[PDB]
Design a protein around this ligand. Structure first.
Ligand SMILES: CCCCCC(=O)CP(=O)(O)O
Ligand SMILES: [Mg+2]
Ligand SMILES: [Mg+2]
Ligand SMILES: [Mg+2]
Length: 254
């Protein structure tokens, strides 16, 4: 509710915090499965697409031992028939990786390039709860710095903020962090985030919906608040009593 005087930075989780889970789980990711074949068919000749498929082929070779693994065999030729077969293999491999929650760099890389087309072309918009932007603006007016921490790549994060239901709000963010800085349930990740930002762990207030993230940040001597939004995983009675909860960014007083 009332931020400690020592806080100078607000670190924000995305899914379940600034953005509903429904958008991420039922819109953002399913979009990939629905568009990967069309995307590959249309942009196969692109140097970037060729590089993406190259990475996916390498990954497919490394997963060859896994049961149910989908191979991306060497093309049979360079005719349109051979290409159709190739494309199907890549599509099948991508969907397979997504069915299990395998978030490899090869997969994330292609997803990011596909999302760039979706958001830039205005086919999709990143959903933010109505209280987010106004609160963030006031926070910044009060001198607070604002950073984002999500498992989604920074490149993908920028697309979300650049094409939100609130328009382009990239300027409201001072920086982004993804799994490169470490995993969200590891306290060490938060100590590094403080280092990258250029502050102390105690100058940070992290807002997240998952308690496993909250407890990891607390262990890193970071201040935390648990955000409750529609569709979020329930909190235990003890967690509801232990953590400071907020149902809106407006509930935070500086
Ligand atoms: C661009 C990808 C989706 C990002 C939504 C996420 O926040 C997931 P996570 O809960 O791993 O931080
Ligand atoms: Mg979350
Ligand atoms: Mg440090
Ligand atoms: Mg202290």
């Amino acid at each position: 509710l009332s931020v400690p005087a020592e806080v100078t930075v607000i670190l924000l989780d995305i899914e379940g915090t600034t953005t509903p889970i429904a958008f991420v789980k039922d819109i953002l990711f399913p979009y990939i499965e629905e568009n990967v074949k069309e995307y590959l068919q249309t942009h196969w000749e692109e140097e970037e697409c060729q590089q993406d498929v190259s990475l996916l082929r390498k990954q497919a070779e490394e997963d060859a031992h896994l049961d149910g693994a989908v191979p991306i065999p060497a093309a049979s030729g360079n005719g349109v028939d051979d290409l159709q077969q190739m494309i199907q293999a890549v599509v099948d491999n991508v969907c397979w990786q997504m069915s299990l929650d395998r978030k490899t760099t090869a997969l994330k890389q292609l997803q990011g390039h596909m999302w760039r087309a979706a958001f830039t072309a205005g086919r999709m918009k990143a959903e933010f709860f109505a209280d987010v932007v106004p609160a963030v603006r006031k926070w910044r007016e009060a001198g607070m710095k604002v950073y984002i921490y999500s498992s989604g790549s920074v490149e993908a994060q920028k697309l979300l903020f650049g094409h939100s239901t609130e328009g382009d709000i990239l300027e409201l963010v001072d920086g982004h962090f993804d799994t490169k800085i470490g995993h969200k349930v590891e306290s060490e990740s938060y100590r590094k985030i403080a280092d990258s930002i250029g502050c102390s762990t105690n100058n940070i207030l992290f807002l997240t919906d998952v308690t496993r993230e909250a407890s990891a940040a607390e262990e890193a001597d970071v201040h935390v608040a648990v955000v409750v939004r529609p569709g979020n995983a329930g909190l235990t009675d003890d967690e509801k009593t232990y953590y400071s909860l907020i149902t809106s960014f407006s509930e935070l007083y500086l």
